[PDB]
């Protein structure tokens, strides 16, 4: 990828918290989101992302290495984080649009799955909303963790699929907090007993069926993103 000189970056306003995210411009031209900061792990993260090209995965302009704190320079996504966007635009969403959002994410995730990339932190807060409400996965939390993850630390694309199910719930609930007021231990025990998040009003029976398939106890009973994508698309086509 391209190396970016600090002089080429204009930091306009802080927009995110964690490192930090700033609204800015590169070369007095492109609107960018600048993410300031382990330095080597921070850079490698960018290196991985710059070689993964998909319409539903966020893209970088480059890396600014010269001056501490080092930063990553991303494309600007006008509607920000999905979690935030869902909450602010609550009441304006048709079910079809919410399903479309899930499809966008599923597309990105199927590409990552094929590339043998586990996200490990897939959630609406780690998705971004751009031009014409296109959703992109970014940055590629027990409430999003599968049973084999919170118990055995057993990650796979199938554990991402569980996370995606929770993301679907976030989307169809229009940005509600999953398992609100519940402690980590309460989430673990409830899910292990068989508790699943309720069906949001905007989620059809068909959509909820898919959520529950993402929430199967055994990873092998969950669909891969590649197949999940077609299941989601089929519901859209059915009407
Ligand atoms: C006034 C209302 N505002 C418009 C949505 C809300 C404030 N703005 C916002 O929250 C916001 C906006 C408009 N973009 C981002 C973040 C990113 C972006 O654009 N590309 C990225 C690439 C990588 C990444 F890790 C974050 C971002 C935020 C937090």
Curated annotation (Swiss-Prot):
Tell me a GO cellular component: plasma membrane
**Induction, as annotated:** Through a myriad of surface receptors including the TCR/CD3 signaling complex, coreceptors, or chemokine receptors.
User: Chief subcellular site?
Assistant: cytoplasm
One BP annotation, GO: signal transduction
Could you list this entry's UniProt keywords, alphabetically sorted.
Answer: Adaptive immunity, ATP-binding, Cytoplasm, Disease variant, Immunity, Kinase, Metal-binding, Nucleotide-binding, Nucleus, Phosphoprotein, SH2 domain, SH3 domain, Transferase, Tyrosine-protein kinase, Ubl conjugation, Zinc, Zinc-finger
Q: Is Zinc there in the keyword field?
A: yes
Q: Where is the active site?
A: 121
Q: Which cysteines are joined by disulfide bonds?
A: none
Entry comment describing in which tissues the protein is expressed: T-cell lines and natural killer cell lines.
Q: Name one GO molecular function term.
A: non-membrane spanning protein tyrosine kinase activity
Free-text description of this protein's post-translational modifications in UniProt: Ubiquitinated.
Q: Where is the Protein kinase domain?
A: 9-235
Q: Which residues bind ATP?
A: 15-21, 35
Sites of the modification Phosphoserine?
A: 185
Similarity comment = Belongs to the protein kinase superfamily. Tyr protein kinase family. TEC subfamily.
Show the domain comment.
The N-terminal PH domain allows ITK to be recruited to the plasma membrane by an activated PI3 kinase. This domain also contains a proline-rich region (PRR). The adjoining domain is a SH3 domain, which binds to PRR (from itself or from other proteins). Next, a SH2 domain is required for binding tyrosine-phosphorylated substrates. In the C-terminal region, the kinase domain is required for tyrosine phosphorylation.
Indicate the quaternary assembly. Homooligomerizes; this association negatively regulates kinase activity. Interacts with PPIA/CYPA; this interaction regulates TCR signal strength via a proline-directed conformational switch in ITK. Interacts with THEMIS. Interacts with FASLG. Interacts with VAV1; this interaction is important for VAV1 localization and TCR-induced actin polarization. Interacts with TBX21.
Protein name as catalogued: Tyrosine-protein kinase ITK/TSK
Gene field: ITK
Q: Which residues of the full protein are shown?
A: 357 to 619 of 620
């Amino acid at each position: 990828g391209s190396v970016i000189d600090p002089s080429e970056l204009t930091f306009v306003q802080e927009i995110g918290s964690g490192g930090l995210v700033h609204l800015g411009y590169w070369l007095n031209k492109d609107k960018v989101a600048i993410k300031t900061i382990s330095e080597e792990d921070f850079i490698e993260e960018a290196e991985v992302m710059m070689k993964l090209s998909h319409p539903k995965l966020v893209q970088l302009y480059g890396v600014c290495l010269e001056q501490a704190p080092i930063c990553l320079v991303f494309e600007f996504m006008e509607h920000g984080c999905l979690s935030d966007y869902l909450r602010t635009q609550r009441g304006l969403f048709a079910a079809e649009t919410l399903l479309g959002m899930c499809l966008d994410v599923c597309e990105g995730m199927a590409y990552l799955e094929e590339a043998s990339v586990i996200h490990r932190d897939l959630a609406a807060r780690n998705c971004l909303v751009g031009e014409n409400q296109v959703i992109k996965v970014s940055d590629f939390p027990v409430k999003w963790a599968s049973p084999e993850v919170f118990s055995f630390s057993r990650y796979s694309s199938k554990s991402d699929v569980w996370s995606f199910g929770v993301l679907m719930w976030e989307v169809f609930s229009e940005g509600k907090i999953p398992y609100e007021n519940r402690s980590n231990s309460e989430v673990v025990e409830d899910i292990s007993t068989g508790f699943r998040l309720y069906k949001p009003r905007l989620a059809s029976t068909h959509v909820y069926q898919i959520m529950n398939h993402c929430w199967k106890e055994r990873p092998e009973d969950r669909p891969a993103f590649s197949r999940l994508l077609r299941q989601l698309a089929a519901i859209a086509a059915s009407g």
